[PDB]
Amino acid sequence: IESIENLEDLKGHSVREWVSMAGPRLEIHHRFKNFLRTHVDSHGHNVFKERISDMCKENRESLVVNYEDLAAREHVLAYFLPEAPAELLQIFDEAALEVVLAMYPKYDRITNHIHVRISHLPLVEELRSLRQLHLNQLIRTSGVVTSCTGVLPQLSMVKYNCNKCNFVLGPFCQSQNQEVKPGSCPECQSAGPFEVNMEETIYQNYQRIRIQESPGKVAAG
């Protein structure tokens, strides 16, 4: 894959498919790795060396990136980030894992994924002002948390025992949209009462919160 000297020329694509295809994906990956490795603050201190070191000291599995720093240092990543946030956040997580395992080669024992979190995004929105124009875009809102579920286990990559034979169905990704139905067993074609393999299934923490407008920002009555 040749390095792409200009990510900015979409050449008629939209941002989502443009960053989904391999060339721009690798270019974004390398640009984010270089950003993490070489970004320095106003005093010349490498901020992300310190941040990754603190994260690995405390086993926290998550890396907060300042959007102001990203926009200042690497423009096109900040350009594509709010347009295709899921795709670029996946790529950023991969790149951050590469940098983290460069710094701490044994951190795979503690984690298998690094979550890149974005802070100080200028795209601030009021809850009353969210429209269909903001769909599938990275927004920033404010409010008071009024409800919280308990921390619940959710399927992320689920495996199913076949209802008759001993085969196990392949990894199916959970989507947040609907229940994943296994289909039919490829060994024998049965499609009966399948059951989750708890030991081979990968779970993730889930918590659904309800936020509302803060009572001092809502109008009286």
Add this chain to the structure above:
Amino acid sequence: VDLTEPIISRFDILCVVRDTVDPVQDEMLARFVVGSHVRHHPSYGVEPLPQEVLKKYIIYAKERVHPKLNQMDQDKVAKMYSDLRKESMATGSIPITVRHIESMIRMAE
């Protein structure tokens, strides 16, 4: 005050603020207030910290630091508490109970 002894004794520090006339202090207070209204327009001697620095200092002092008491010269505080109890019984101004001793330890920490 109209409050009662069980709630009065639960307050470690008990402050009285009065608004009595004193012309020199009134002049200095007026100059400070008008200067504040000038300073904060939309546009003691010792100097304070910036409030951001103070917030960082506070959370560091509260979470990363933990005082430990080795000694506190028990005779001094014990005699103080004993005759503070005597004068409180004399005037009736404030109940002193046992909580004021532990307030001393807390304020030192």
Add this chain to the structure above:
Amino acid sequence: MFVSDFRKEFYEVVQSQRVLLFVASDVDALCACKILQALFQCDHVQYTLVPVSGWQELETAFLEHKEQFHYFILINCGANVDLLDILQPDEDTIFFVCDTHRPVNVVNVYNDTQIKLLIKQDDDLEVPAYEDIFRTMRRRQRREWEARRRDILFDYEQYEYHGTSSAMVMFELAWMLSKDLNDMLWWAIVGLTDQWVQDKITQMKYVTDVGVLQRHVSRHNHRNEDEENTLSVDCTRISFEYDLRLVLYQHWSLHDSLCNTSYTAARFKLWSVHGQKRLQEFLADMGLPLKQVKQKFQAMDISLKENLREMIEESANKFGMKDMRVQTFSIHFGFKHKFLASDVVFATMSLMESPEKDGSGTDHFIQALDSLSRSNLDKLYHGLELAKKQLRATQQTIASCLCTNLVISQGPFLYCSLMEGTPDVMLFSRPASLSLLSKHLLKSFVCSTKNRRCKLLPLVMAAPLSMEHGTVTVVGIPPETDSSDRKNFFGRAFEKAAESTSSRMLHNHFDLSVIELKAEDRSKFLDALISLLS
């Protein structure tokens, strides 16, 4: 005089007789006592055993028992004083002296009839010749000879230190008798490890003595065992280990071990608020999860443990701790009982120096002596719990001293003082625990301070002892350089200061560098010490 052959001139003599053991309160003394007890119990030697915690109670016990016994054995006491003058014995008693303290008193060396020294002749010994020490122009040369005697004898008596372990001496006796059981070899190992843990010997000498003990370990491990015939799990197996320097780390969490080991606590400066982040950086460099590190070692995941020692060494080398490994030994028996020699040392030492007020110091001696036999494994595990408490209290006290800056450089020597009523001072009131505290605190101070001058000084520490008589225990420690030969002058400096000031100094502990002092005289005593060391 020195006993040339322990079998012929000591053991075969006392084998036919009633014997009285005076045993000092330290783990090496306890181990030598265990070995000698085992030999005497094999041969039906009707002995009596008396613990002695100091010179005055040794004198009291001798006054009580001198009528009934003609043969006495002193374990880790007596060699460094004139026993004839101290005890005033009858003309026909015999004192066998198995003692690590050096230099041996010249009267003890050149007494040829009554004092018999169970000391290896190849130890670090340089005794002055007899004619240099013992008996107009003729009387002028007599006075000149006396002046030369004072010079030579000061040069001899200046530096106090420790020789070969008494437990190792008694094990060599057991080997010559060919009644050396595997538990006797373990007790010898524990005595040498007591010397090493308390820093009474140099690392070179410790490595040499470990090299000696390795061959005995191999012999015992091939008495009835090889790669294809093996014994029951009941039998004891002693193994040579190139293990970690961490303290008790197989009996509590690796986190507690790193926090309460003197070396790593001093290096990471964990008394300071900032040092915990240094330790977390070390653990992250290793790649150990903090939950696993804080879990108990026996409950830690086994995938983390089977290369942990070399992982520790590899990370320590790039952190600048170039010697995290140590040549040591371990003992296994049954299915679950496993101890490092350091673990047994710390457990027995804690049982001796326990902070409990119930009973007495002799009762605590008895608990420690019982814990060295495998019929009292419950006592050994209780001692391990007490050792965890003792190590934690040691680190809290070091943190208090360094944070409050009680360690002040008094020119020739650093000075520190514990205060009455402050935490754990009653635990550290006993001289052995106080010596360990002062050594650990000096290492912590040397790692803490940035001044090049302060890293080379010795340290004097005081602590309260008495209020019914108003006295303090004072200890002197040499510098903590890696070049150090583990010799100190404070035993003689203290008495020179005490006689220069006519201070009320009392000298009960078997080490000259530990004294009792009236609380009022410490000011002029310290003034004389600054004047003397100059």
